[PDB]
Curated annotation (Swiss-Prot), chain A:
The lineage of its organism: Bacteria, Pseudomonadati, Pseudomonadota, Gammaproteobacteria, Vibrionales. One of its GO terms (biological process) is riboflavin biosynthetic process. This is 3,4-dihydroxy-2-butanone 4-phosphate synthase. It is an enzyme of class 4 (lyase). Pathway: Cofactor biosynthesis; riboflavin biosynthesis; 2-hydroxy-3-oxobutyl phosphate from D-ribulose 5-phosphate: step 1/1. Homodimer. Its cofactor is Mg(2+); Mn(2+).
From Swiss-Prot, chain B:
D-ribulose 5-phosphate binds at R35, E36, D40, R140, R141, G142, H143, T144, E164. It comes from the Bacteria. It comes from Vibrio cholerae serotype O1 (strain ATCC 39315 / El Tor Inaba N16961). This is 3,4-dihydroxy-2-butanone 4-phosphate synthase. The lineage of its organism: Bacteria, Pseudomonadati, Pseudomonadota, Gammaproteobacteria, Vibrionales. InterPro entries: DHBP_synth_RibB-like_a/b_dom (IPR017945), DHBP_synthase_RibB (IPR000422).
Length: 199, 207
């Protein structure tokens, strides 16, 4: 029986993930079920809280990435790290990062709303998502759109306390400890193709 | 009376920090004794371990910066990003995803290497180099200058790593949290003001 088989079959893993995100909860994302995979925590920006950001900083690499559509990154006039122009100080606190992220992901945002450089790291998702490119950036934005949420999400790599990166079993264990659905990009590909999801 | 009184007079605080760095231990740095200041953990690159880096990732913002001299930054072709910030960097060899504590140390060692070439490093990456102003803290009172100044003053390889101490709830550690962390971990706490007084007092050009 596969590693993630206890989280259910691929379709179930995706559906549980989408439901968690709709409820404002986070998920864990892997390339596939290979046991040597590293994994990220994902939160929806729509419901992002200071406490969630704080957990990321505590538990992950701390290099927290903001995954955006091409259109939203264009709207911000991004090519580079970013900082909210207003409402923050050193930019690095969990509240400051959330402010910066909320500011950047805002569909009514203007480029001047952000300063550059900063302490939040935006990534552009490829058009087509995981069906075009199997990256965690694509997986993040796809999950938001499939969940019917603001098409922006935050990711950060889960880190073991000794500083090595969490691999699949540690990610599974973390998901169980925090009631976070675990799923894979492979899961998402099977799901999108099966349910004809052009996003 | 002063918030940092426990760590000694300004001159003592600097002497103790230098000694700790000489012994391969880390220190904590603040602008001054003001309560609202946020503080950084500093480690010397020369003696940097996986475990030290893991502590930074675990306890701090995770945006670990590499403070370099101008000479070294130029040796790496790392111009200002847009500012003291440059593009992020990754070791070309000897790493994988580049984000593990070991991989960042590898990247940092490769970058700080006196005999390093710009082509030892891929960009972007997961380590964030910062350019220190010539003159150090006597020219600019930044933590980047503080870090490189401490290394030169301690006689070490002129490169250090810094990261902002972060409380569990995501807020940034201020002077009282910084003092508690320092005592708990046997890490000297000092200020940039301390370093300014010391460098002038002891007529320290560092070049």
């Amino acid at each position: 029986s596969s590693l993630l088989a206890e989280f259910g079959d691929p379709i179930t893993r995706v559906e549980n993930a989408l439901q968690a995100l709709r409820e404002g909860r986070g998920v864990l994302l892997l390339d596939d079920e290979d046991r040597e995979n590293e994994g990220d925590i994902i939160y929806a920006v729509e419901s992002l809280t200071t406490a969630q950001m704080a957990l990321m900083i505590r538990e992950c690499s701390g290099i927290v990435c903001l995954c955006l559509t091409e259109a939203q990154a264009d709207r911000l006039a991004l090519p580079v790290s970013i900082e909210a122009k207003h409402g923050v100080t050193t930019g690095v606190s969990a509240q400051d990062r959330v402010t910066t992220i909320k500011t950047a992901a805002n569909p009514q945002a203007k480029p001047e709303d952000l300063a550059r450089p900063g302490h939040v790291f935006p990534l552009r998702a490829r058009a087509g998502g995981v069906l075009a490119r199997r990256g965690h950036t694509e997986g993040t934005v796809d999950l938001m759109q499939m969940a019917g949420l603001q098409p922006a999400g935050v990711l950060c790599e889960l880190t073991n306390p000794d500083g090595s990166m969490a691999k699949t079993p540690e990610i599974i264990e973390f998901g169980k400890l925090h009631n976070m659905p675990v799923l894979t990009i492979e899961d998402m590909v099977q799901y999108r193709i099966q349910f004809d999801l052009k996003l």
